[PDB]
Ligand binder design. Structure first.
Ligand SMILES: *[C@@](=O)([C]([C][C][C])[N]C(=O)[C]([C][C]([C])[C])[N]C(=O)[C]([C]/[C]=[C]/[C][C]([C])[C])[C]([C])[C])C(=O)[N][C]C(=O)[N][C](C([O])=O)C1=[C][C]=[C][C]=[C]1
Ligand SMILES: [Zn+2]
Ligand SMILES: [Zn+2]
Lengths: 183, 22, 16, 151
């Protein structure tokens, strides 16, 4: 990967095609990118492909199957406690690689394809250098937090809000991903 | 329950580019 | 004179 | 698609502009007080700062704005008029050294271009290259704050 981290988004389907696809569980669409904007019939969020696996937040995907060209695909991993789930990365996607530098300077990629700076304050916390309204981060759960090199340091899970403005973010560090696989 | 459906993508691998005059 | 825009650059590389 | 960086020309020369906070900024040494072309006629500069070599008109059509950097990183990246990205280490407020010096020919026509941080956020606008013997070893730039202040 490289820097500066720049990202863009593309919508691939709408509400009706999404509902149909959700039921049939068969999606014939072409897949590209490291992060997929994903949706159930109740909510929409993100899923990040790290090392051949498409990871996302359990509180979003539950135990559901991901719709694929060959019909539904069951999850490879499920960890209610760590709030993780993973499916084999879709055919066409590009995976990110875990961070191996321990940089405290993280960058969150939102569902709007905006990358916002986050200062790591702990294993699963980092503070937004420029806080934003929580409505801005809605739908970004499952999205990546990269180090200056563009490597996955963790997955966005929850926001730390005060009066509707998020000051910090709660994430799932890649270590939990490794652990969830060994489990 | 239904399946989680991919409704879009976010591409980090893109690099600065002169937008094509099309 | 006047400054004219001869082209554009998209930093993310967004195609199309 | 919408572009953040516009490639402009003045007959005299050609350079770049960068939309930050809805304003299309570029170098005074390129545009001067010139207006920018529009399908409805010439549009005038919203800001002109001969002192800072900074001029800005309202962001044009087919453009999208860059966000100022708020992470402080010293690891900058310059985007040229050819979409080439060049890693630059921040030496100070308006100076940064190329990690791999290049002949000035490579940095030509890029004034006005953005000086991005690791997050693709604007740090400054490439003002002019600082070179030794035809080799651009570093660059001069206008920090975003100057722009945010000019507004
Ligand atoms: C994602 O699941 C979100 C991000 C929203 C900031 N996170 C949560 O919902 C979590 C879930 C919880 C951890 C089980 N909850 C929160 O972040 C709470 C705060 C809790 C903090 C605890 C912390 C200290 C450990 C806040 C108050 C919400 C997510 O994005 N979910 C999908 C979603 O929001 N979908 C929306 C929808 O209706 O489809 C959506 C999507 C796009 C635009 C608007 C709304
Ligand atoms: Zn790293
Ligand atoms: Zn920054």
């Amino acid at each position: 990967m490289g820097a500066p981290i720049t990202a863009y988004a593309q919508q691939t389907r709408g509400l009706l095609g999404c509902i149909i696809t959700s039921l049939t569980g068969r999606d014939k669409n072409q897949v590209e990118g490291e992060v997929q904007i994903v949706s159930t019939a109740t909510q929409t969020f993100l899923a990040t492909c790290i090392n051949g696996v498409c990871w996302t937040v359990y509180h979003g995907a539950g135990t559901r199957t991901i719709a694929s060209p060959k019909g539904p695909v069951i999850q490879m991993y499920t960890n209610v406690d760590q709030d993780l789930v993973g499916w084999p990365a879709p055919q066409g996607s590009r995976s990110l690689t875990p961070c191996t530098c321990g940089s405290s300077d993280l960058y969150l990629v939102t569902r709007h394809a905006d990358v916002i700076p986050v200062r790591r304050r702990g294993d699963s916390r980092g503070s937004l250098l420029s806080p934003r309204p929580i409505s801005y981060l809605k739908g970004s759960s499952g999205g990546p937090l990269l180090c200056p090199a563009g490597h996955a340091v963790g997955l966005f899970r929850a926001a730390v809000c005060t009066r509707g403005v998020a000051k910090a973010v709660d994430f799932i560090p890649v270590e939990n991903l490794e652990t969830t696989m060994r489990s | 329950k239904g399946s989680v459906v991919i409704v879009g993508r976010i591409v980090l691998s893109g690099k600065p580019a002169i937008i094509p005059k099309k």
